Amino acid sequence: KPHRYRPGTVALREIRRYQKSTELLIRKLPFQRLVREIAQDFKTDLRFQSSAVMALQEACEAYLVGLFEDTNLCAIHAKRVTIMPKDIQLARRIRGERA
Template identity: 70%
Template structure:
């Protein structure tokens, strides 16, 4: 019996086979080694045997690249590890991410100390000099002014964005802010 190689019956058709029955009978009659006579070559009427060769792979994993020889580097232990390239997002993706982030949050966006300094400076300019220098502020008072200022700015930018969209643009400009303030009036609030 030939060894099993995984090939089908058709692939084995043209290969010569040893006759097991005749070989056993001859072996029992004489002690001489017996070899089977080669069969006649395939005649034109017999089915042709097609040699199958391994084809090129069509998918799957890429062949493993040759291993690179490690070259000596001048990196010493304890050196900071080099960072890879920062990820590049498509234009507009980061802006939409930031919009969602700031719409979810409740905290104030302007820093507290610079805003407090600005409030104190404006108060000193508006009040008489003898009162302005002695003026003290509670932290809650400055926080309330900051809340109102940020709400005013957010509402102004919403109207400004509508003005830019009305002009068939997506970029807001100074003329959009001026138009929004003119439409709202001198003391246009959050109405």
């Protein structure tokens, strides 16, 4: 029968691969469409510089990576290895975004 890794090996391999790099991890066109949709419920007939959408993407990705680090800390605190929504909620509450 063919080769097969055990659950948890490819996960660590991807952790190393993506902590070693600096690329952008969300696709560009879907994010640009999301940004335009939000902004157009704020004001109609707007235009965006490309640098503006790139800056928004950098900020969003940095935010989400920090939040996932804090979530992993909480999940380990509860003696687990799987992150769950209650970990995100506790991180955002202690951090100061849900008061």
